[PDB]
Paper text:
To neutralize chemokines, ticks secrete small cysteine-rich chemokine-binding proteins in their saliva with no homologues in mammals, termed Evasins.
CCL5 can oligomerize, forming dimers and oligomers of a higher order, which would complicate analysis of Evasin-4 binding. To prevent higher-order CCL5-oligomerization, the E66S CCL5 mutant was used for further experiments, as it mainly forms dimers at physiological pH. Although solubility was improved to some extent by increasing the amount of salt in the protein buffer or adding organic solvents such as glycerol, crystals that were obtained in these trials consisted of E66S CCL5 only. These crystals were used to solve the E66S CCL5 structure by X-ray crystallography. As expected, E66S CCL5 formed a dimer and had a structure very similar to that of WT CCL5 with a root-mean-square deviation (RMSD) of 0.63 Å for the backbone of the full-length protein. The chemical perturbation plot of monomer/dimer equilibria obtained from the 15N-1H HSQC spectrum of 20 μm E66S CCL5 at pH 4.5, showed that dimerization mostly affected residues of the N-terminal region (Ser4–Ile15), 30s loop (Ser31–Cys34), and β3-strand (Arg47–Cys50). This observation goes in line with the obtained crystal structure because the E66S CCL5 dimer interface is formed by interactions of the N terminus with the 30s loop and β3-strand. The affected residues comprised a continuous surface in the 3D structure of E66S CCL5, coinciding with the E66S CCL5 dimer interface, which suggests that binding of Evasin-4 causes disruption of the CCL5 dimer.
Numbering used by the authors:
A (entry chain A): 3 to 67
B (entry chain B): 3 to 66
Write the structure that this text describes.
Amino acid sequence: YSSDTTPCCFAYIARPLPRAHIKEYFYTSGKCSNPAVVFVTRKNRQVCANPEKKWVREYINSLSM
Amino acid sequence: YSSDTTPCCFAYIARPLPRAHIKEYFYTSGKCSNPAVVFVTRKNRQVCANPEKKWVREYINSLS
């Protein structure tokens, strides 16, 4: 079993980030207690977000284009 | 409560790391389900270790 660390999220950003500031996303490991999308901003900040939220799913659909 | 990510551990390294390869350590957040020490190597690898093990406690003492 991997002994590397892996990033987990413990709170979700409450309000949508500006779409234009987001360049990438990834999901946190299923081993984490919470499911999460992490948005990577153009300043290379990583922001935890709730995968069940409509705006989060909309951003994912757009980023996957 | 921050929406930053934080590193968590899900397995512990079984064999002691070479002490000469470690530059620092930190404990993972209490928000993680498992307690852990992270040893950071000089190549910036983050290696999870079991805080209950004698070698882990010895390494922590030497780094601090």
